[PDB]
PDB file of C-alpha atoms in Angstrom:
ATOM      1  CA  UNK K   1      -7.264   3.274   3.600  1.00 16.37           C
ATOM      2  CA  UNK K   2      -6.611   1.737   7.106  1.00 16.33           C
ATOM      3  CA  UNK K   3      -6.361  -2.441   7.595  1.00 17.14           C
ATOM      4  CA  UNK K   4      -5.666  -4.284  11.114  1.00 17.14           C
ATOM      5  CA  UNK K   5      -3.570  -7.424  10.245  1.00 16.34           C
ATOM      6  CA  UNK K   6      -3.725  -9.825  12.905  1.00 17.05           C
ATOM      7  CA  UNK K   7      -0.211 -11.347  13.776  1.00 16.17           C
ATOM      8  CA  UNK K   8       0.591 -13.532  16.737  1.00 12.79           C
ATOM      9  CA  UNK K   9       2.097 -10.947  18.721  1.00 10.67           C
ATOM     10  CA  UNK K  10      -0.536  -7.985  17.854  1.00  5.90           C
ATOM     11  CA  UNK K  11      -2.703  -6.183  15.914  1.00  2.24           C
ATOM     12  CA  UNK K  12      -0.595  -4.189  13.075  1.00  2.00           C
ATOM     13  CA  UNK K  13      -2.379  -1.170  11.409  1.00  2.00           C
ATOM     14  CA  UNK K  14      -1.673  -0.327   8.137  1.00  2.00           C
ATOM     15  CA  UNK K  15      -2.284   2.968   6.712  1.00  2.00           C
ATOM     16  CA  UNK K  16      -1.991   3.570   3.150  1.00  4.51           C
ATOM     17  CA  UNK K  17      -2.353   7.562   1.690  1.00  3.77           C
ATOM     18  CA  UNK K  18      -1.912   8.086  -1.949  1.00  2.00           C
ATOM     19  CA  UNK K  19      -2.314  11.210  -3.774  1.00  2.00           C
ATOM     20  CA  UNK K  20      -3.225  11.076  -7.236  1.00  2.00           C
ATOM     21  CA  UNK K  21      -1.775  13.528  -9.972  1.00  4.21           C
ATOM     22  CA  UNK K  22      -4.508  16.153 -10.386  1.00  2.00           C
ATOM     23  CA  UNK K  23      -3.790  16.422 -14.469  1.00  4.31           C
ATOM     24  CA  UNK K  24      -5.075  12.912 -15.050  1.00  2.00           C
ATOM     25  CA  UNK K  25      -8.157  13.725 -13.545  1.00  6.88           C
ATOM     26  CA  UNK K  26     -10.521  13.971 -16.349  1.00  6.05           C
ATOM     27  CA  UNK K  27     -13.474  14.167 -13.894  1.00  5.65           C
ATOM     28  CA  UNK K  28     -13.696  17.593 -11.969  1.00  5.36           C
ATOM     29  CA  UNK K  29     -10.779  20.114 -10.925  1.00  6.01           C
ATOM     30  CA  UNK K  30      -7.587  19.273 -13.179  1.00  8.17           C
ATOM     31  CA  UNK K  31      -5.126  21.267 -10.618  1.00  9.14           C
ATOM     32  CA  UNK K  32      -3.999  22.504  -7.637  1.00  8.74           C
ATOM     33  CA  UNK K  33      -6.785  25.557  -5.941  1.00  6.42           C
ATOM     34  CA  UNK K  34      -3.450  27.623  -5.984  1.00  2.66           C
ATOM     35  CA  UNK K  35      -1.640  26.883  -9.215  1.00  3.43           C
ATOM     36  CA  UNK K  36      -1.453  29.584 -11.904  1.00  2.84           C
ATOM     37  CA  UNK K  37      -0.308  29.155 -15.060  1.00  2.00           C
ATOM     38  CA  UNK K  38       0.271  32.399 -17.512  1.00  2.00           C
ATOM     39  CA  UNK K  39       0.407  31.232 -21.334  1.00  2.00           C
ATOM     40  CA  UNK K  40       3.290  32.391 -22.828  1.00  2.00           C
ATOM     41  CA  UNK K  41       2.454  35.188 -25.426  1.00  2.00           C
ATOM     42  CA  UNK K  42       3.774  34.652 -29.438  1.00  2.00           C
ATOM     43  CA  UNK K  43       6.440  37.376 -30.090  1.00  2.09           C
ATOM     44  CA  UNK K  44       5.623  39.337 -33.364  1.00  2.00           C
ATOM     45  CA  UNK K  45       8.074  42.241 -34.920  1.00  2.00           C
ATOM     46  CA  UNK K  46       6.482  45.819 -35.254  1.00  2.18           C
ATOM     47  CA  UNK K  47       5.350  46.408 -38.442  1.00  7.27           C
ATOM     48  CA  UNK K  48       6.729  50.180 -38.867  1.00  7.32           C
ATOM     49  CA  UNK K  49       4.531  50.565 -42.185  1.00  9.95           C
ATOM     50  CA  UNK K  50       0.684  51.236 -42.697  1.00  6.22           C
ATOM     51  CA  UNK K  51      -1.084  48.873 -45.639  1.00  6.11           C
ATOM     52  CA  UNK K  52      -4.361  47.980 -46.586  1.00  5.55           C
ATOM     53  CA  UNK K  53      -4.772  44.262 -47.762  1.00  4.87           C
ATOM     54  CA  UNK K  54      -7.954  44.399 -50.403  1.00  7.15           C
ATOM     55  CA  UNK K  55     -10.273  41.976 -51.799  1.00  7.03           C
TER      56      UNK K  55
ATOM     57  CA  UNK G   1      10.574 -36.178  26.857  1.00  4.14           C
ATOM     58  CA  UNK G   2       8.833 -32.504  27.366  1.00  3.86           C
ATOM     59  CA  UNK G   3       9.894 -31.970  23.326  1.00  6.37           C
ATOM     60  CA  UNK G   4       8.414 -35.016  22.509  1.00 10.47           C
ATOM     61  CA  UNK G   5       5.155 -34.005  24.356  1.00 11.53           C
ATOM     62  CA  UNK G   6       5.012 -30.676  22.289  1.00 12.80           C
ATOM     63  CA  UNK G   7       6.022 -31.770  18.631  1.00 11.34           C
ATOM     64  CA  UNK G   8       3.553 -34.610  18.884  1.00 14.34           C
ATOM     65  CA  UNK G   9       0.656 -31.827  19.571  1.00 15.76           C
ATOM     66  CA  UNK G  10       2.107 -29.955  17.618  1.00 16.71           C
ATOM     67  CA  UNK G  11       1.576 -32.708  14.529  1.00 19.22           C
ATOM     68  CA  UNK G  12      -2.196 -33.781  16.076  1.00 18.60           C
ATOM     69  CA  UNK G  13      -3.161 -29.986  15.702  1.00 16.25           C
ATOM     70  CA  UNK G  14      -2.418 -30.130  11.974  1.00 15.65           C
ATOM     71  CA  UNK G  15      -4.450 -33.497  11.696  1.00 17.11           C
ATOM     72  CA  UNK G  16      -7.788 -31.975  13.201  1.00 19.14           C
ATOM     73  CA  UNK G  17      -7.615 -28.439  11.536  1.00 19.74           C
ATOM     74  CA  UNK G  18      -7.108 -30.520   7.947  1.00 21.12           C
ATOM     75  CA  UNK G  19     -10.674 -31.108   7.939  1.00 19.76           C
ATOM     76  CA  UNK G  20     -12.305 -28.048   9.188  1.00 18.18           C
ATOM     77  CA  UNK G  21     -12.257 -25.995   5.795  1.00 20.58           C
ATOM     78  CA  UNK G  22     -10.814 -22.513   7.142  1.00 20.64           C
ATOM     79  CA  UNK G  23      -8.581 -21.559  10.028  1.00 17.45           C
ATOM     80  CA  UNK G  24      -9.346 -22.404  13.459  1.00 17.71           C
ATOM     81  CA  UNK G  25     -11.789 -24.781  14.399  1.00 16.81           C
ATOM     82  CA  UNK G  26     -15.352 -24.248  14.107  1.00 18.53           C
ATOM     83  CA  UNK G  27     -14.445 -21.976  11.406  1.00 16.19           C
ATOM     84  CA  UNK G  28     -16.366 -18.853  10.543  1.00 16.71           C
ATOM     85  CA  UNK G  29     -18.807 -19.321  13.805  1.00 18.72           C
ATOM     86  CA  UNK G  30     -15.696 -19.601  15.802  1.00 18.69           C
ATOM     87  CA  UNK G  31     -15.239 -15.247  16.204  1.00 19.66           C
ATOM     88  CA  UNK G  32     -11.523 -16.342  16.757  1.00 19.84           C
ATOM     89  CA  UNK G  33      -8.957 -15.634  13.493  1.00 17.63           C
ATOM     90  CA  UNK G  34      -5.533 -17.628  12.247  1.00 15.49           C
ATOM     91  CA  UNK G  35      -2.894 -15.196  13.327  1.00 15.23           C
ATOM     92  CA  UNK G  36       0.401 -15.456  11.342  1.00 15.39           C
ATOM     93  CA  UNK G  37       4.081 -14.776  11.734  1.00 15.76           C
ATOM     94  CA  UNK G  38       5.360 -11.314  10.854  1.00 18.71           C
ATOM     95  CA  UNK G  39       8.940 -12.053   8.648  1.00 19.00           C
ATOM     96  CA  UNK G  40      11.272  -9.293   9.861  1.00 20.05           C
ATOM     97  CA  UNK G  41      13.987 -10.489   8.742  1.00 19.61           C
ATOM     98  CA  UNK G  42      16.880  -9.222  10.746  1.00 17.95           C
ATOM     99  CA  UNK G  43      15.660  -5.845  10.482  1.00 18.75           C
ATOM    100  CA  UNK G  44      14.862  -5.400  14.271  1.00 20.06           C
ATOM    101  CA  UNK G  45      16.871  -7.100  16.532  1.00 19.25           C
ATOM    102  CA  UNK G  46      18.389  -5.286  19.694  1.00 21.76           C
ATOM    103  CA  UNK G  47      16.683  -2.472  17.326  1.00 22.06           C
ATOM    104  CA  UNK G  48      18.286   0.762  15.528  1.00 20.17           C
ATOM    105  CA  UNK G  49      18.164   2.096  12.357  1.00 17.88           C
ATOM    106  CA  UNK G  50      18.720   0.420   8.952  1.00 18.56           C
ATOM    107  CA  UNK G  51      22.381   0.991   7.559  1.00 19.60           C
ATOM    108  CA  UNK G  52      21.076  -1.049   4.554  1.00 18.25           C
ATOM    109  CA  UNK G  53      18.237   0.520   2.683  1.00 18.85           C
ATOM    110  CA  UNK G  54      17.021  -1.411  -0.380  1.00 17.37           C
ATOM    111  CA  UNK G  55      17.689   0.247  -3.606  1.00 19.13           C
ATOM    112  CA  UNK G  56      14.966  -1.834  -5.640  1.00 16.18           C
ATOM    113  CA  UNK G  57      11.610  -3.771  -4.685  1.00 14.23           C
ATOM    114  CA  UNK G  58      10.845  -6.898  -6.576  1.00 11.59           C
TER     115      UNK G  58
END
């Protein structure tokens, strides 16, 4: 946004720029084009023994 | 004398600008704005940069 005040020695512009966080979005892209995000994978022990649950 | 000249206009230009509703006369036909007075403070005098930033805005 862009404003012209009117003072008594001039015209002063104003510029205002203000970037809005991208994961408060709720409406359209919710990040960056370029940020990646891997999900972190759950860590499970080797089981080491064959079994057969039944029902 | 000349002071006395220029603070009584000064006090006749608030007396004809109380009745017309918005800033200079004629108002909103007039094409011509109020200006006002930029408050600098002491920020810019024989000018250089600002030893003392301000930590905390109102």
């Amino acid at each position: 946004a862009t404003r012209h005040v009117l003072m008594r020695q001039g015209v002063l512009g104003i510029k205002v720029k203000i970037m809005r966080d991208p994961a408060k979005s709720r409406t359209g892209p919710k990040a960056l084009p370029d940020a990646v995000t891997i999900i972190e994978p759950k860590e499970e022990e080797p089981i080491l023994a064959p079994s057969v649950k039944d029902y | 004398l000349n002071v006395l000249i220029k603070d009584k206009e000064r006090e006749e230009r608030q007396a004809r600008l109380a009745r017309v509703r918005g800033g200079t006369a004629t108002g909103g036909a007039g094409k011509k704005k109020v200006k006002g007075k930029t408050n600098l403070g002491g920020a810019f005098k024989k000018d250089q940069d600002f030893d003392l930033d301000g930590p905390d805005d109102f």
